[PDB]
Structure formats: structure tokens, C-alpha cells
Symmetry: C5
Subunit: 362 residues, 5 copies
């Protein structure tokens, strides 16, 4: 029978001794805050500035003794979010972030629900440009581990304690997909406490293990390099007397291998360690460069042939240099793709075992 | 005869028991909100970040019993938008969005119209960077379906219910055109209700079917690839003894095919499935590569010819290798464009039937 | 003798019955608002997102009967812009716009001047990213018509009427120049009234006719294409037996024509109609491709010559094929630039007459 | 002995008749405002959108008679910047600007100092994206004159007059350097008064003469063009019978000259007048194109030689065509670099005299 | 026993004489402020606009006598950051900065802790786009010294004095790494006082010495240039009669050296001094150009050979020109890589000693 306006100005009134600046149960045990997040959107992962953009529904549960009411019989009592000025919302800030803008569209995207015993549910929707450091030791295949840290500002560990939720940890939205990565099902909850000269502060963090998909990099980078190496193999069947043809074919394959290697590393930060694509493009470039060196040795042997022919064992030395120049081409035509196939299976199995070692060590 | 200032401070006065924080007909049936949007601008569709930018006139109709007035005889009573602080505007937020900024130019772009029985018309102009996931299984021709979701924050399904309008659904502005797409005439209205641990929330969505126009991609991508394949066909008429000419022509056609294929995929996200342009550029690249292989086989047969000529059935084996080297060119000159025409009609009709299957399944 | 503070709190005081929420002469004829704009900056015209950025001094003149004062003898009475909260500024918003931010530097850039009879002068400085659709049927030469629409939000045609000024229409700043376009001297004032389900709203618009300057596109695009076609003509004087030279020259001219055509269309939206540069680059590419086809026919005739010479009317058939192979080069050397000159004068005069037809039809 | 709180609420109190909306010495002579700016940062000069970014310390000095105090004996009395709401700051706005955001970091970056007789010192730190039109008649060497205009909004010339400072004009920070330009020591102070239909408004402007440094453009653009022309000269020493070598060398030098000319104009607005780099790249391209034409004439004369040799004064006509084909190469080998050196010294001295004429006319 | 609300409204109440506009110990000695910063994130260093982005925890310690309390026995008394409106926070602003936005996510990221004797701890989290000028005299290896200046606005040296902290200077976060640079362990604390016409202002600065990592530039820039020079060395073994082969190989190596040199300088400001990569690419380009000149001299000597052979000491002059043309190739094949190795060791040791001289002079 009681009207709701006096009831919802009674608990936050200045005739009441609420004092929203003062934390609950002052001069006592620390407040325990339970947090669960809901990943609404995850994406826009950029490697060159090492950050990613999430959309989260940050839900914070804490108990306030002064907010308890015994008049109304309903337990939930969902409230309007405009009177969220004097409730004592806890301070929370993300340790590694940029941006972090609120959503003010059509209303402030906020949820306030005060239970009968004093439990408060506080939900806010925020997009954060979270910055995570990434390791690029293996660029085509890798398991990145993005770190999201939630800690407090201005309340030490003896006054405010942040804890993860027990029923579930992180709720991902159904149907959420990433175009370049695959989000793993398990998520780590390791809370570490940062120490500062001012004091220690409560901090909880969650880790997402991101598997990079290998379907795009196989089409864009691995197959055109094989096309270039196969073309340099095609140069072996051409006639050895046709010098501009073989020289031009080999030179253009080396040039396009260099430009392809320079263009695949363009969308990457300037890291100072050797990656896997470096190894792949280096061995492919070495293969086309060795093909050009093989033709240069063949044409040098033919040069020695032509100088000793035109100005005495001349016939059998002509035979020896033509037979040797034919033997080099005949053994190269078999030896080049076989050693390339050996390198391919060795590289692929060692990266398969180091990828499985990364997924086993985690 | 009554002056308007007391009348428009009477209904929102604190001597009145309006209480704009409290929802209308509290502790009763849920409020029913009818929404229709007016697409003022639609465009700026970017594939690489998978989002689009709309300009909408969001109109929300709901009934308030406390707002009803019986003194004035006029039914419409358009009001000034500055007193839109205490009216109980409903909470609405878009589920998949970025940005969503209001228009504050020369006034707040808002409309408030309170009917005599209590019906409230609330119109706001907002630009939203709506994020939609897109499928790129067929890149030149495709029918994208952009999804716009409108749901509530902080009021469950038992308290707030969102419904679409019956007289029309989505009003598009007259004369509105898209440079890259064609907006279909019908629009789906399927409302789905999202479930969360806190509770269930009302949500309505509208789907726009966007037909990608095929006029630009025919000029930019399909015809230069045909030019490259026709040039590789031109290489068959050149003399077989002119080895640097045919080798250089074929090598530059393969190189420019590779760079054209790498440059057409630049304005696209790094997806991990095979698209239609992948198939097209792959078959065209295979055609120019097979032309280079055909010349390599011709010059290998001529090599065998020259070695057996210069160091016995020599005349008729010279005839056999010259006749075979002529026969390969003569059959290739006919066989290459005919099999290319066969591939063209097969690819085009299978993509026509899969495009019509996409437009029939919807 | 009267001090100014009471006089300027008398007309906007709450002891006065001003009521700035209520429009002037309520329940009567509509308010007539006269608007003239002053183009302070115009520029930053981008084709790929189809919008332009103006800086305008929006001046709005309307009459308020309650604001009239008879105490002071001065007629102008320029006022301070801080008390522009309760004056009843009219609602105005641009129909096709993005951005539209106010200038808050060192003060709010505003002007308020209330005349003695009640005339109010309201000037504000705003930069608007106005979005205009453009037609690219002729890309090098074209006359774009940018549309600026000013309409009201929340006041129908019976309550608010917008009208253009009679003394002048749009004042452009002296010395204002555009690097890529030429602003015409006349400007259209056609007011059209938009109709919506809620009601009809007053709207006035102004059109600027922008002539695209042809000096840059002649240097960047038209002359290098002529350089490529002249180089392909140079290929006719080279010896026909030198096959790698003529083949390589023609192939590199075709390749660079393709890359030049692909690079000139890069700073343009993905439109689906044929433009004028498409026609120009297509005919130039056809010319260099026909030159390569002419050399392929010459070397095919020489191939027939060489096969019938080396394995009977042999001398006179050698004469016939050498004379025909010389005659093809001799007639091509004259016929190629003459038909190119004919195409040039036809293309140029038809685009001159369609440009003058566009400027005559307007 | 007087406490400071009553003294600093006495002069701005509503029990005082200060009335900060009303300008000082109302209904009298115009207020005289003295302005000096301090260039803290100058840079980020972009040619393609024709604007530059400054950081200025805007100091405004004006006298207020009502602010005068005779109680305290100190003359300076530096005040706190939070009570800068009611002081009657003068209206000032920059005529050609974008952005112009204030600095709100750790405090509002403001200075307020009220002298004993009524002199007010008002300093604010602002970064402005000032837009200046630039002339690109000579692109490598040029003296740009950036214009910064400071005028008033809403107060005419009879009420507000802006004047420059007498002790110094513009203070540049010590150690301030520009990477691409050199700031001259003198600065022009020409005040021009803008006239509008509403009235005339006071305006003062300052001009900075910016000398473009020529060290970068000599390395990036002038020397690689000389490398290309020297390579085309190297083509003269190669054997005339080696036709693919000389043809390929000349064709690749023409192609790379075209791409170098197209790439140096990329970071520039689309202006419609001929610049100096246009002239330089045009003459260098003409030189490499004439070298290709010279080889085409040599090989045409050799063609006439070969046709009259193989199907009578044959020996002496063979002599005449070989001697003439040798004489063309021998005279070209001397004549090409000498005429290039003549063009170089003529171009360089005429641009030196037109640069000195620009610096003498100013 | 005293409740906290009256105690925390007593010290900031208007019944108290706090007067937060007035600085502490007015008309006396200057306030001494001790500042220590905590580098939370450091990165996003861009060379082309010469600025870097930090995340700092700015801690300011100063003593206020009026804030002292003797009632409560606790010494720390951490307070809520909402009542940081009237505390007299000191004015602080960074001298060389852009941006500098506060963090408003979930709360204002602020810390307020008032000690018992009057010591105030004020911590704020800010991201600043700090602009630092950089010297690019040696581009691959260099030690940049970023300067962060903290000074006051509106309080002179006699009223406000800024001092660095004694216990530590700058705290870097543990685990913080930079992808392109290495942050040195020591940091300079040199405070310089800026002088202005208005007065002198306190300023303290901190310098970070940044070592540029050399691992990326060795892979991206130094090794492909060696590949190009090694390929030009490979051109010496090819047959001298094969003129199109050697000419084409040398010409394409010169062309790709030019494009590689133009592409490595793309991500750099337009500086006007010679860098180290300029010297490296210039010597490598000189090496490939000299190889092309060596082949041109060889083919000129062979031209003289062919003209004196075909139209008398003819046999021994044929011997002299063939022996000399062989001797040039034989001495070049040894002399080119040896002088390249000499240049490599000289360049590397002189840059090692100038890098160590830069790290010794600091
Ligand atoms: C025919 C292909 C072979 C390879 C020929 O190619 C070349 C020379 C000769 C070869 C045999 C190549 C090609 C053009 C042709 C010349 C043909 C014409 C001048 C035009 O084409 C026709 C055909 C076209 O329908 C395939 C048809 O479009 C319709 C489609 C739509 O209605 C269904 C509608 O929207 C509208 C009505 O228009 C239209 C009648 O125009 C010319 C306009 C084609 C565009 C040229 C393009 C310009 O930039 C492109 C690209 O940057 C590349 C690098 C160079 C050009 C090129 O590639 O040049 C290019 O692609 O010469
Ligand atoms: C003539 C064409 C053939 C192909 C010739 O081309 C080449 C060499 C010889 C060939 C026979 C090619 C060309 C230049 C010429 C040399 C000609 C001159 C030096 C200049 O040209 C004249 C002609 C021009 O009117 C067509 C005329 O403009 C007027 C137009 C307007 O009044 C109506 C007005 O705005 C103003 C008065 O100026 C003007 C008198 O200047 C030279 C300045 C031309 C520009 C050169 C350009 C620089 O970058 C361009 C591009 O990056 C490309 C890659 C290289 C250059 C080129 O392409 O070089 C380039 O295009 O040599
Ligand atoms: C040796 C030079 C000649 C020219 C050879 O070049 C080519 C083939 C054969 C020529 C004789 C060229 C070159 C690679 C070699 C093959 C050599 C190996 C595969 C690798 O190299 C070694 C040498 C390198 O120390 C110079 C050394 O790095 C250390 C430095 C640091 O410790 C001090 C530390 O960070 C870490 C330990 O790693 C390391 C052992 O790896 C290969 C990984 C080199 C990188 C290849 C690059 C990939 O993209 C680049 C570029 O896009 C270009 C276009 C193609 C590649 C290339 O240029 O290919 C490229 O540059 O083949
Ligand atoms: C879709 C393929 C279209 C081209 C195939 C259709 C072209 C084709 O059939 O080749 C004729 C030729 C044999 O000629 P022939 O029929 O007289 O025996 O084949 C080859 O030897 C090398 C071809 C290169 C084979 C390269 C295979 C990748």
C-alpha cells in the first residue's frame, strides 16, 4: 500500500544517514565484490599496435548493509538507472586499456538491482581497446593469450577485495565468431595483486587463448612462393645456349620472390626476432638463387668450352665439357624438387610439433 | 483561456505526483512500445571491418496514464524538446553497434508529442555504426543481410515489451541510393528475445537484404584477367626459335597475373575460406602457367632435335621432331581458347544458379 | 538613465511571463524565419565518401512580440551571447550532414541582437560535413551540384515556416578559392517541403554548381597515356628479325598501360557505370594491344616464309612474303597515328559538346 | 589584515554591481585589447589539406574600471583560474581554423592576473589547426606565408577594438625547430578589418614567412632522375647490332622515369598549374625518350643498309650508311650530356633568380 | 565514536574557512610539491610525426596546513575521489604534449589521501601524446632521448615550486617491453626553469634514453641490398658475347636497388641531413652501377675488336683486344667483392665507434 516515491527517496535521502561517499561497513572488514563479464563483441584485433577491442557487460555484485529494506515483500526490485549518483559504486579500472567509453545512446546503458538483504547488482556496457602484448615467434600458426586485468584505484587490499564469480567465469555470446582467430573454450582465472609504493591493490584477471586460423595464410603466402619455386624449376628444361631466356627467367623469379617477401611482412610490427615466414621466404629465395647460380656455372663451363674450341685433345675435351654441362642439368632437374620436398616435410612437421608443444604447455 | 505555462508545469511539477523515475502503471502489466524507424541515410559500407553507417529517425510510441489531460480540447499538442528530462523515456540500446552519437546542432534533434489520452511520440535522430557479420563465400555476387537489433537494458520482459509497428515497418527515404549495393524492397521483421543470467529482455530486429552490384567488378577485375590470358594466347603465334621472346612474354604474363590477383584481394578481410575471385584468378593463372609449360615442352623437343642433329635415320627423326613440334603448337592454338570458353560458361552458369539459389532460399 | 542589469533581467525574468519554451504568438499564424548563410570556408571535397566540408555563418531572423521594448531609444542593442538559454531559438537541422560541431574557442561563437520592434538576429558559426551524392558519368570534366538542405525538427508547417532572404542569397567570402574546383557565381534557391507520417516540415535548400578543373587531369592522366601509345608506335621502326626487341617493347607497353589504368581509378568510389577515363584508357590499351597483334601477324608471315624456304616457285613466293611483310609495316606506320588522331578529335569534341550540354541544361 | 575570501567575493559578488554580461565602460568609447601570442609548438604542416598546427599562449590585455581595488597594497595579485566565469572575458575567434581545443589536463590551462588600476591579463593555451592557402608555383624551393587571423564575434568596431602589442609582436620559443621548413626572423603585423552586412568587426593578423628547406628534395628527387639520365647515356656505348640490349635499356629507363615522376607528385594537392618538378621531370623524360628515338633512327639506317645489301654502287653505299650510323652515335655521345649540362645551369640559375625575386618582393 | 560524515564535511564546509581558491599558507613561502610518476604503458612511438604515447600515474605530494586534523587517531585516512572539487589541487601541465585525456571509466581514476599533519597524496592516471624532437643522424642505430616536461600555469616561482622525489625518480612497471626500442635503466632528472615576460615558472623534466634495436633493420634492409650486390657480381661470370643477358641483369639490379632505397625511406620524416641508410644504399647502388659500367667498357672494347676485324697487324691486335677484354673480367671478378668487403668493415666499425661515442657522451 505504500507509494514508491517516498520509499525510493527514503533510502537515498539526506534525512537518512546513507552518506554515499563513505564505503559500506566502514572501519571493518573489506568489501567483497564478485565480478562476471559477458563478452558481447570481440574482434578488431590488430597486430601492428598490439591491441584488441571488446564489448563487455560488466556485472559487479557487492553487499551494502545500509541499503537493506524490510517494508516491501518483493525480493528483486529492479530500479531506474538515473539515481546511480549516490549508491557507492565501487571503483574499478582496467590496467591495460585505451578508450573505454560508456554508451549514452537513448539512455545510459546501466542496470541497478538492489535485493532485500542488501545485495546490489550493477551492470554497465563498455567497449575497451584492451592492449595486450603478443609473441610473434611463429607467425602463421600461433596461440595468442590476451590478458584482461581489472583492478581498483584508491582503495587498498584491506578495504576492497575483488573476486571472480563461482558460477561460471566469462560468458561469451552465442553465435560470436572471429574472422581471423578461434576462441578457445576454457579461460584462465588467475588473480594477481599489484604492489605499489602507496599500497597493494586488489586485481583479478582473465586470459583468452586465441588460436590463429591457418586457412588464409596458406592461400595468400605459401602457395605463391611455391609457384615461384616451381617456375624456377621450369627454367632447367630450357636450352642452355638460349642465355637471355634462362637468365631473364631466373632473375625475374628472384625479384618477385624478394617483393613477395617484402610485402607479406608489411602488416606486422617491427619485431626483432626471426619468425616462421622469415624462414620460409628465406629458404624459397635461397632455392631460386641457387637455380640462378646453377645456370651461371653451366654457362661458365660452356664458356671454357667455347674458348678452348676457337682461338690437341680437342674432341675429347669438347666431349668432357658438353657431357659435364649436360650432367649438371640432368642431376639438377631431379635434385632440386626432391630436396625441396625434404625441406617442406621437415619444416611442416617441426612446426606441427612446436605448435602442439605450445598447445600442451599452454 | 488557460495560459500554457501553468499547464505545462502542472503535469511535470513536483506538486504533481508524476515521479519520472517510476515507470507507468507500476506493479502491473508491461508497457508496450511500438517502434518504427526511418532510414535517412544508409551507406559507408566497409568490408574490412564488417560494419555500416545508418542515419535513422527512431520513433517510439508508448502510453502513459499519468500524462493524460482533459482541460485542453486539442488532440496533438506538439511540445518543446527541452523538457524531456522527466517524461520517462524508455531505455533502448542497439545490440551490435559502435559510435551512436546524438545530433546537437542548433538544438537537440528531438520530437515530443503527447496525445490527449496519454499516447507519447518520441523521435530522435541518431547515426549508428552498426556492425554486421558478412559471409564472403561468393565475393563478386552476393546478397548480404544486415541485422539491426533494438533491445532494452535494465527492464525485463515482464516490465517492458518492444513491438514493431503494424502500419509499415521501415520507411526508407525517397531518392536514397547506394553506390555499391542495391537495397531490396522487402524487409524482415523477426523479433527474438535474448536470455541472460539476470533475466530475459525484449528485443526486436530488422533485416535489410543488400544485393551487391556486379558492374564495377566486371570492369576492374574480370576483363584485365581476360586481357592477360589473351596475351598468353598471342604467345603461340611467335616463332619457336625465338626463345627469349616467347619466354619473356610468358614470364611477364605470369608475373602480372600474380600481382593482379594479389591486388584485388587487398580491400578485403583476412577470411579463411575460398571465394569466387580466388577460383577465377586461380584458373586464369593456371592457364598462363600452362602456356609457359607448353613452350617449355616445345623447346625441349627442339633441344632433342638439335642434339641428335649435331654431335642413322637422321632425316626422318628430324622430320618427326619438327612435325611433332609443329603439331603441338597447332593443336594448342585451337585447344587453349576453346577450353577457356568452356570454363567460362561453366563458371558463369554455376554462379548464376548459386546466386539464384541464394535469392530463392533467402 | 536606467541601468542595464535590471533591463536585461526584466525581459527574461521569471517575474515576466516570457516562457521561452512557448513559441511566439502561440495559437496563431506560423513564425516566419529568414535565413542567409555566409560561406567562410569551402573545401575538403572527397569523392570516395561523397561529402564536403563547409564553414558557414548561419544567420536566422525572426520576430518575437514579447521581446519588444519601448524604454531605451537605441535600435540595435547588441547583447552578450551567454544569455541565449531562454530566447526561443528556432530548431534547425541540416538534412544531409555528418559532424556539425559548434565552435567553443575562447567563447561560444554566437551573435544575439534584438531590435526595438522585436526582430531577433541569431548568428552561429558551424562546420558541417555535408554529404552530397555525385554523378560520375564524365570523370575528368563534370559539373557537380552540391545540395545543402535546412529543415526543422518538431515543428510542422503550420507552426514554423522557413524562407530564404530577399537581399542576396548566399554570401561567399572574398578571396575564397578551391584547388580542384571552380565555384559558379549563381546559386539556386529551390525550397521543397518534406512530408513524413508525423506531418509536413518546412525546408529550404541551396545548390552550388561546382565546375571540376581540367588542368590536373590533363597532366597526370592524359599525357602519360599518349607517351605509352607513342612508344608503341616507335616499335614499328625496329627490325622485324629482332623478335625479342619488338615483343618485349610491346609487352611492356601493354603492362604499363594496364597499371596506369588501374592506378588512375584508385581514388574513386566503386561506381557501376562507364566513365570517360574508362573509355580513354580502354582505347589507348586497345591501340597498344593492336600494335602487339600486328607484330604477331608479321612474325607469323615470316614463319611461313622460313618454313617454305628451308625443309618450286620458291623465289617469287619469298618475294611475295617479304613484300607483304614489308607492306604491313609500311601501311601500319602511317595508319596507326592517323586513326589515333581521328579518335582524339572525335572524343574531345563529343565531350566538349556533352560538357556544354550539361552547362546549358544545368 | 583583511582576509582574502571576502575581498575576492566582494568584486564578483551579486551584492556588487559588477554584471559580467555588460561590457566595461558601457555606452562609451570602445574597449582596447592588446594581444601578444607565444608560439610554443609549430609544425605538422601538411600540403595536401593545406593546414598547419600551432600551440599558442594567447595573452589578452584590457582595462576594466569596475575591477579596480584600492584596499590591498600589492600591484600584481595573481588569481586562481576557477573564477573566470564572471570577469567579462572578450570574445575572440580565429577566422581560418579547425579544431581549436582547450587543454583540460590536471587543471584548465588558464592565467588570470588583475592589476590594481584595472588592467587584466588573460592567458590561455590552445592548439589550432590553422588553415592557410599555399601557392605551389615552385615546389622544391618556395617561401610560404602562413596567415593567422584573430577577430571578434558579436561586438562591432565601435564597441571592441583589437590591437597588437608594441613591445614585441610574436614570441617564438627558444630551441623551436621545424624539420621541413625554416621560420624567418621577421613577422608582419598587418591588421585588416572585415566588413559584413551585420557590421564591421575588428581583426588583427600575423604572417609567418616559411622557407622550405631544399636538402631533402635534392636527395630524394633530383639525384635519382640524374641517375636515370646517366644510364640512358650509357646506352650509347653498347653495340648497335645488339638490338634487344639497347632497346630494353632505353625502354626500362623511360618506364622508371615515368613511375618516378608519378611517385614524386603523390604527396601533393591536385593543383592545376605547372610546378617546377613538372618541368624537371618533363625535361629528364624528354632526354631519355630522345635517346630511344636516336637508337630507333640508327637501327632504321641499318635496316636500309641490310635491305640494300641482301635482296650497283653497293660498296660505297654500305660505307655511307655505316659511316653515317657511326657518326650519329659519335656525335650523340658528346651532344647529349653537354645539352643536359646547359639545361641544368639554365634551370638552376632561373630558379635561383626567381627564388631571390620572391624573397626580395616578399 | 565520531561519525564520519560531519568530519568530512567539517574540513571542506563553508562554515569552515577553507577557501579552496586560496593557496595554502597565503602571503608566505612558496608551496613545495614533490612529484613521482609511474610509467604504466610506454609505446606507440612514431617517427614521422615525432611523438610517443605514455600512460603515467602522476603522484603529487604537497602540504596543506588548514587540512590538518587532530580528532581521529588514524594516520592515512584514504578518501573518496568525488570530493576533489575543493581541495586546492595544484596546477600542472605538460609543456610538450597533445591529447592528455583523463580516464572516466567506471569512476574517475583518482586517488586522494590526506595525512594527519596535512600531507596530501594526489594520484591521477593520464595518457599523454608527448611530442619529442628526435635526431636522425644515424638511422639504423641511435639513442633517442625523449623529454617529458612538467610545469605550472598561473603560479610563479615565488608562489609554487616543483621538485622531484628523493626516494626513486620514475617507476617503470615490471614486465614492460617495447617492440622497437630498449629503455635504459638510468633516467636523468634535470630541472630547468622557463622564463616568460609574465614571469618565471617552476618546471621539472625527466629524460628517457631509448636504444633503437638493430635486429629488424638488419633483416629488412641490409640483407636484401647484399642480395642485389651479389647478383650483380653474378653477372661477371656470364658470357661477354651474350649482350642482352648481361645488360638486362645489370639494368634490373640497378632498378630494384633504386626502388628498395626509395621504399626504405618511406616511413620517415622529410629530414634534410644525410642518414646512415642513405650512405649504405648509395654505396650499394654505386656498386651495381659500376658493374654495369664495367660491362659497357667490355662491350666497347669488343666493338673496337669487331670493327677492326670486319670492314695489317690484325691477328695480334685481335689478341690484344680479346686478352684485354678477358683481363678486365678476370680482375673485376676478384676486385669487386674485396673492395665491397673493405667498405663493409670500414662502415661497420665507424658506426660502431660513433654509436659507442654517442653512448659515452650521452
Ligand atoms: C573484351 C575483353 C578483351 C580482353 C578486350 O579488352 C580490351 C581491348 C581488346 C581486348 C580484346 C580490354 C579492355 C577494354 C576493351 C575495349 C572494350 C570497350 C571499350 C568497353 O568494354 C565494353 C564491354 C563491357 O562488357 C564486358 C560493357 O560493359 C557494360 C556492362 C554493364 O551492362 C551489362 C553496364 O555497366 C554498362 C552498359 O557497361 C561495355 C559496353 O563496355 C570498355 C568500357 C571496358 C572497360 C575498360 C576498363 C577501363 O579500366 C579497366 C582496367 O583498369 C584495365 C586495367 C584497362 C581496361 C581494359 O581492360 O580494357 C578496363 O578493363 O579492350
Ligand atoms: C606532348 C605529349 C608527348 C607524349 C610528349 O610527352 C613528353 C615528352 C615528349 C613527348 C612527345 C611527355 C610529357 C611532357 C613532354 C614535354 C612537354 C612540356 C615540358 C610540358 O607540356 C606542355 C604541354 C601542356 O599541354 C598539353 C601545357 O599545359 C598547359 C595546360 C593549361 O593550359 C591550357 C595550363 O594548366 C598550363 C598553361 O599548362 C604546358 C605548356 O606544358 C610539360 C609541363 C607537361 C607535363 C609533364 C608531366 C609531369 O608529370 C607527369 C606525369 O607524372 C608523367 C609520368 C611524366 C610527364 C610527362 O608525361 O612528360 C608528366 O606528364 O615530354
Ligand atoms: C647472407 C646474405 C646473402 C645475400 C644471402 O641472402 C639469402 C640467400 C643466400 C644469400 C647468399 C638472402 C636472405 C636470407 C639468406 C638465408 C640465411 C638464413 C635463412 C637467415 O639468415 C641468418 C643470418 C642472420 O644474420 C645476418 C641471423 O640473424 C640473427 C640476427 C640476430 O642475432 C645477432 C638475432 O635477431 C637472430 C638470432 O637472428 C640469422 C641466424 O639468420 C634468414 C633468417 C635471414 C632473414 C631473411 C629475410 C626474410 O625477409 C627478408 C626480406 O623480406 C627479403 C626480401 C628476403 C630475405 C632474404 O633476404 O634472404 C629476408 O632478408 O639467403
Ligand atoms: C585447365 C587446363 C587447360 C590447359 C589444358 C589444355 C591444353 C592441353 O591439352 O595441352 C596440350 C599438350 C599436349 O598436346 P597434345 O594433345 O597434342 O598431346 O599438353 C602438354 O603436353 C603440356 C600442357 C601443359 C599441362 C599443364 C597442366 C597444369
Amino acid at each position: 500500500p505504500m507509494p514508491p516515491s517516498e520509499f525510493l527517496d527514503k533510502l537515498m535521502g539526506k534525512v537518512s544517514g546513507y552518506d554515499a561517499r563513505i564505503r559500506p561497513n566502514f572501519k571493518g572488514p573489506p568489501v567483497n565484490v564478485t565480478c562476471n563479464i559477458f563478452i558481447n563483441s570481440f574482434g578488431s584485433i590488430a597486430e601492428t599496435t598490439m591491441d584488441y577491442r571488446v564489448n563487455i557487460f560488466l556485472r559487479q555484485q557487492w553487499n551494502d548493509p545500509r541499503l537493506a529494506y524490510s517494508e516491501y515483500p518483493d525480493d528483486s526490485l529492479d530500479l531506474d538507472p538515473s539515481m546511480l549518483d549516490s549508491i557507492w559504486k565501487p571503483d574499478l579500472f582496467f590496467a591495460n586499456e585505451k578508450g573505454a567509453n560508456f554508451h549514452e545512446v537513448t539512455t545510459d546503458n546501466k542496470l541497478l538491482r538492489i535485493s532485500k538483504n542488501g545485495n546490489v547488482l550493477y551492470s554497465i556496457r563498455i567497449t575497451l581497446v584492451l592492449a595486450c602484448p603478443m609473441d610473434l615467434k611463429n607467425f602463421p600458426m600461433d596461440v595468442q593469450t590476451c590478458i584482461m586485468q581489472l583492478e581498483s584505484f584508491g582503495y587498498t587490499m584491506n578495504d576492497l577485495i575483488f573476486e571472480w564469480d563461482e558460477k561460471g567465469a566469462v560468458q561469451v555470446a552465442d553465435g560470436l565468431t572471429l574472422p581471423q582467430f578461434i576462441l578457445k573454450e576454457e579461460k584462465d582465472l588467475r588473480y594477481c595483486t599489484k604492489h605499489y609504493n602507496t599500497g597493494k591493490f586488489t586485481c583479478i584477471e582473465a586470459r583468452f587463448h586465441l588460436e590463429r586460423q591457418m586457412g588464409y595464410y596458406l592461400i595468400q603466402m605459401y602457395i605463391p612462393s611455391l609457384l615461384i619455386v616451381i617456375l624456377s624449376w621450369v627454367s632447367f628444361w630450357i636450352n642452355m645456349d638460349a642465355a637471355p631466356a634462362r637468365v631473364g627467367l631466373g632473375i625475374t623469379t628472384v625479384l618477385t620472390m624478394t617483393t613477395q617477401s617484402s610485402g607479406s611482412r608489411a602488416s606486422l610490427p617491427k619485431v626483432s626476432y626471426v619468425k616462421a615466414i622469415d624462414i620460409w621466404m628465406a629458404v624459397c629465395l635461397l632455392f631460386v638463387f641457387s637455380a640462378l647460380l646453377e645456370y651461371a656455372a653451366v654457362n661458365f663451363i660452356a664458356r671454357q668450352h667455347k674458348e678452348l674450341l676457337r682461338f690437341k685433345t680437342v674432341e675429347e675435351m669438347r666431349k668432357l665439357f658438353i657431357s659435364r654441362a649436360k650432367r649438371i642439368d640432368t642431376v639438377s632437374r631431379v635434385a632440386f624438387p626432391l630436396v625441396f620436398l625434404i625441406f617442406n616435410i621437415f619444416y611442416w612437421i617441426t612446426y606441427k610439433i612446436i605448435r602442439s608443444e605450445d598447445i600442451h604447455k599452454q
